[PDB]
Amino acid sequence: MNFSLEGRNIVVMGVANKRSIAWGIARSLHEAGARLIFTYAGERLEKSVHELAGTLDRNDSIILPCDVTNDAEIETCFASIKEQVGVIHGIAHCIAFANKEELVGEYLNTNRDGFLLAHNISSYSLTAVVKAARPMMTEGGSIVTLTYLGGELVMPNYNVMGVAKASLDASVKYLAADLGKENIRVNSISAGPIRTLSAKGSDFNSILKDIEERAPLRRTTTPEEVGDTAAFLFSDMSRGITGENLHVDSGFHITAR
Amino acid sequence: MNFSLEGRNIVVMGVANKRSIAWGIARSLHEAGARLIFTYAGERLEKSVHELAGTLDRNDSIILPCDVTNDAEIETCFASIKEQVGVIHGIAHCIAFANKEELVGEYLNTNRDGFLLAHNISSYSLTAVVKAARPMMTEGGSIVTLTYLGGELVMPNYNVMGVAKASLDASVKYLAADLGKENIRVNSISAGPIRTLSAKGISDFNSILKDIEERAPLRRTTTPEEVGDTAAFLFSDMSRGITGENLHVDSGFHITAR
Amino acid sequence: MNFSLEGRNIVVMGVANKRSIAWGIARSLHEAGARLIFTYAGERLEKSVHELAGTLDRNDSIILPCDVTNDAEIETCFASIKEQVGVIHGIAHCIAGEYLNTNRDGFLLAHNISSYSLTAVVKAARPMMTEGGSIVTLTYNVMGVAKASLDASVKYLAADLGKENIRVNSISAGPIRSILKDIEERAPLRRTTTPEEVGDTAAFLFSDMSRGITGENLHVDSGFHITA
Amino acid sequence: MNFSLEGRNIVVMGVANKRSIAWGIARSLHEAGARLIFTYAGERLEKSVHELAGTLDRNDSIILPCDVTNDAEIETCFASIKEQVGVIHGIAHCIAFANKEELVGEYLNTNRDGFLLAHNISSYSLTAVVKAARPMMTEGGSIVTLTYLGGELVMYNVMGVAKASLDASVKYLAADLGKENIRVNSISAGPILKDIEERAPLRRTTTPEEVGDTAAFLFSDMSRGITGENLHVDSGFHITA
Ligand SMILES: NC(=O)c1ccc[n+]([C@@H]2O[C@H](COP(=O)([O-])OP(=O)(O)OC[C@H]3O[C@@H](n4cnc5c(N)ncnc54)[C@H](O)[C@@H]3O)[C@@H](O)[C@H]2O)c1
Ligand SMILES: NC(=O)c1ccc[n+]([C@@H]2O[C@H](COP(=O)([O-])OP(=O)(O)OC[C@H]3O[C@@H](n4cnc5c(N)ncnc54)[C@H](O)[C@@H]3O)[C@@H](O)[C@H]2O)c1
Ligand SMILES: Oc1cc(Cl)ccc1Oc1ccc(Cl)cc1Cl
Ligand SMILES: Oc1cc(Cl)ccc1Oc1ccc(Cl)cc1Cl
């Protein structure tokens, strides 16, 4: 086996801008020679994403809208991906949401709607996407999601997000039990803190300063490092790996002390 | 210190019948000298809980309805508890639910509706009950909930229930981090399978039991008494150094599996 | 059903002084009515424990020397336990810059004293624990490696001895007394931990209240295990 | 970056025959353009390692003796690696051992010797070799060791205990060495049955190629954000009951 992804069609859901971790993954998958399929939420993000495919070397790229809440316009999105490429070999799911006033101080500032909300977007969406994409993954494939250490441990201010990530963390395991027999693998990457759109939602430079000082590899993670890990996960090089969670975070996971 | 729960009021949510784990927690806590405040899920259970509580040695037990899917009923229920006993010293969270056709076959038999229902009843309800109960919890406190190995590993057919349990597992940690400053500890018991109402709907059960009688280290299945008695510890001050923890009360099965 | 340790004989290994966690454990178990059997390593401690046994309500404690490093001595210590009481219901095992400051022999030695020793003492206690029993062990660098070895063995021990109604578990106690300050600021419960707290947890693990629990690790640390 | 191991010198230890996981691993690092330094314990393997080492093209490989007990000849070994190649970029540690009568029946079948022996060979040897290799590891690096599910909970006995020691020595080695830009990670392999084949997510068993491919990743710059990690190469067996 080798590492390349040529002839592999991968949807990368969740790019917002040049800082999106999805975007760093997009880049690494493209370098490996995959054909990317971006999906975005709304229509305000329409130009920014087209503007990013454009800047990618080869052509390839398709660009569909997909709000992950809403089964209706999820099917639309994948009926369309099938029209335009047919067999899908992979999905990078990099989509989470929480109310930002629930991510301050106490976990307890959350509430029924906010809680269900975080779980719907951050956790359920993966299952939803997988249900859609499944009929089209007929040559087997690989599914990757992004998680944070806060799913495992208590990270100041991650609060309800941490709970939903724990929910996602677990769904990864189950999805993997269901889909291994169709030779589809499901794993997560657990990225270290990196500056993104969604990253503004408390005391951030605090965390980034601590890591370079406290994490084994005295530095911060990048979207590149993550994308490179993603690239391996989407490649057959990782064919033996399913239901795993890989900390791409300078080893910060081993220091809690 | 000591084992006695004399002078403590503990709210046990989730009694349904004599087989329920909450009922095992009930006895144990009552016999350690606690005053139990029960909650049933709507009027179907009203008569059955009154009859169960009536069997206890002392006759101080309180009995209130509380349907955890609804902020208003929750505070209503808790507003009453406050009037009656003034201070609450613990909660036994024993509430779960998910759609039964979701817990057969592939995890993928779930859907947006059921997933969130399962998370709402099974995971959110804890946070819910704590928000409401927090103002009454003024002399320390112990909150205990019930999870299962399915929230750690893939268990055949546990499926979306296990994912909700994982959400629960995490909330236990975040709640504990929020509430240790007010001297309230939050923990879970991870129970081995026991035959209860809710067990039905978890298909091929006496197969799973028999397995645990052979494979389990302690070579025997769990009892609600075992669980109840670990809850007793947890509610008591003997356990005052423990919070955010998860105790497997499961005859050691968790190790023979992993 | 009861928290009492009436008529339980518990060996408590690893008492050095009034500060020992082992000692907190001793107090709490004595308090629950257990009869304590203390072991010492080297005759400097013989007097330290002998002293401490005397602070205990009842003069029912037995004092024996046991160097966990040497099998023959361990076989002797327990033969003598059996002679005096015949049967034992529990063991409390409280014996233990860069990580790269370790070396073959010190590495083995940590593992010998800190890991293997639970297995060694359990092999000896085995044929005398016929009334069922509970075994509890206490858990930085090469020590952390040895502790990890100890943790894994708890599970292997548990899986083997369950058929004999013998439970094996561990307690992880947070720092007890400068690193302290931040814990009292960063700990869920906002305080270091105490040896009473550990002890009352060991009492639970030694009684029937905990009969369904085997192969587990209990964090007595004011919640610090859940924080980053 | 790139998946190429070109111009990296990686020590591979514990090759013994064409089945050896370390061989599966040798092959994969070789394919990616690494220069392999093989080590062997005593004459039995001397032959096999040489005979096997031959198999490969681009044959720039190195062959030397190294008993992982015996601090001196570990020193002897790496002193020589230094002479012949200057700088080391990785170790593939694939050594494990415990008496077989002890990996049968109860865990309590073990004794003081087999216990310590198992820890020596299976856990300490990683520290021994990282210590001896460290000085010559002056261009960043990657250390990768071989574990299994028995260190995580019950499956295997005293070897599971040893692997737990191993697993903890990894996190520690990682924390010490990140500063010098050296990564330390473990692969936990599936069995290399009838059980795994029908109850593992990917409905199949593990191949040494799957293990080698994962290694190539961790030795390469693709995995540069990862340290103190334990990857399960096991058709998802770790997630099951
Ligand atoms: N940034 C970090 O340090 C870090 C660490 C660990 C995990 N993560 C995870 O990485 C993932 C990507 O976020 P990011 O950090 O790159 O920030 P980002 O804001 O750049 O990306 C988040 C994406 O989620 C999308 N999204 C929100 N609601 C959506 C909806 N309903 N339908 C479709 N898309 C929706 C946004 O459009 C955006 O594309 C998230 O799941 C996040 O939790 C980030
Ligand atoms: N029996 C087992 O094998 C086992 C094992 C591990 C964990 N558990 C857990 O124990 C807990 C209790 O379940 P059980 O097994 O004792 O079964 P049970 O059916 O006896 O109790 C479940 C209870 O939740 C209550 N409930 C459901 N929806 C509610 C809502 N709308 N509002 C308020 N209450 C509601 C039900 O009335 C019922 O009393 C659950 O969390 C379950 O997951 C059970
Ligand atoms: O998961 C994350 C983890 C970190 Cl450290 C930083 C940013 C993250 O991503 C988010 C944070 C908050 C919200 Cl509301 C949405 C998203 Cl996508
Ligand atoms: O969580 C559980 C685990 C086990 Cl082994 C047995 C029963 C359980 O409890 C439930 C199972 C299914 C549903 Cl719908 C509701 C509940 Cl309360």
Ligand 3: which residue has its CA nearest to atom 7?
A199
d(CA B258, CA B1) in angstroms, rounded, equals: 36
Pairing relationship of beta strands A9-13 and A35-40 according to DSSP bridges: parallel
Helix (H) or strand (E) holding C40: strand C35-40
* D10, D29 Cβ separation under 8 angstroms: yes
DSSP D157-200: HHHHHHHHHHHHHHHHHHHHHGGGTEEEEEEEEPP--HHHHHHS
Q: Print burial letters for B216-228: b (CB count within 10 Å at least 16), e (below 16).
A: bbbebbbbbbbbb
d(CA C221, CA C207) in angstroms, rounded, equals: 21
d(CA B141, CA B240) in angstroms, rounded, equals: 10
d(CA C145, CA D169) in angstroms, rounded, equals: 6
Helix (H, G, I), strand (E, B) or coil at A199: coil
d(CA A4, CA A234) in angstroms, rounded, equals: 9
* Six token digits for residue D145: 């060791």
* Closest CA relative to residue A48, chosen from A11, A12, A17, A92: A17
Testing ligand 1's pocket by substitution, the residue of A49, A146, A160, A200 carrying the most ligand atoms inside 8 A of its CB is: A146
Ligand 3: which residue has its CA nearest to atom 10?
A198
CB contact under 8 A, A251 and D201: no
* Six token digits for residue D209: 């190629």
Binding pocket residue ranges, ligand 4, CB within 6 Å: B 96-98, 100, 103, 148, 161, 193, 198-199, 201-202
Chain C residue with minimum CA distance to D168: C145
* A208, A220 Cβ separation under 8 angstroms: yes
Which residue type occupies C180?
L
Helices (H) and strands (E) in chain D, counts: 8, 7
* Closest CA relative to residue C164, chosen from B229, B252, B193: B252
* Closest CA relative to residue D110, chosen from D146, D161, D164: D161
Helix (H) or strand (E) holding B93: strand B90-93
Q: List C-alpha distances in Å: B107 to A127, B17, B157, D200.
A: 9, 29, 7, 15
* B102, B109 Cβ separation under 8 angstroms: yes
B158 is catalytic: yes
* Six token digits for residue C175: 């720092």
Instruction: Output the CA torsion B178→B189→D230→D211 (10° steps).
Output: -150
Q: List C-alpha distances in Å: B88 to A43, B82, B91, B229, C201.
A: 51, 8, 8, 20, 23
Binding pocket residue ranges, ligand 2, CB within 6 Å: B 14-16, 20-22, 41, 45, 67-69, 94-97, 121, 146, 148, 191, 193-194, 196-199
* B171, B122 Cβ separation under 8 angstroms: no
* Six token digits for residue C211: 């009969």
d(CA D22, CA D94) in angstroms, rounded, equals: 6
Q: Which residues contact C176 (CB under 8 A, 6 or more apart)?
A: C21, C192, C193, C194, C195, C198
D57: left (phi over 0), alpha (psi -120 to 50) or beta: beta
* Closest CA relative to residue D121, chosen from D159, D92, D90: D159
d(CA A66, CA A89) in angstroms, rounded, equals: 18
Helix (H) or strand (E) holding B9: strand B9-13
Chain A residue with minimum CA distance to D241: A177
- Beta partners for residue C172, in sequence order: C219
φ, ψ at B154 (rounded to 5°): -75, 120
The domains of chain C, with CATH numbers, are 1-228 (3.40.50.720)
How many Cα atoms sit within 13 Å of B119 on the Cβ side? 33
Ligand number, closest to the Cα atom of B49: 2
Residue C47, classified by CB atoms within 10 Å of its CB into exposed (0-12), middle (13-18) or buried (19+), is: exposed
Task: Give me the active site residues of C, please.
Answer: 140
Pick the catalytic residue from B40, B107, B124, B158: B158
d(CA D41, CA D44) in angstroms, rounded, equals: 8
Q: To the nearest whole angstrom, how far is the Cα of B26 from the nearest Cα of chain A?
A: 27
* Six token digits for residue D224: 């540069």
- For chain B, which residues lie within 8 Å of any Cβ of chain D, measuring from their own Cβ? 149, 153-156, 254-258
d(CA A161, CA A97) in angstroms, rounded, equals: 8
Helix (H, G, I), strand (E, B) or coil at A140: coil
d(CA C28, CA B26) in angstroms, rounded, equals: 26
* B144, B234 Cβ separation under 8 angstroms: yes
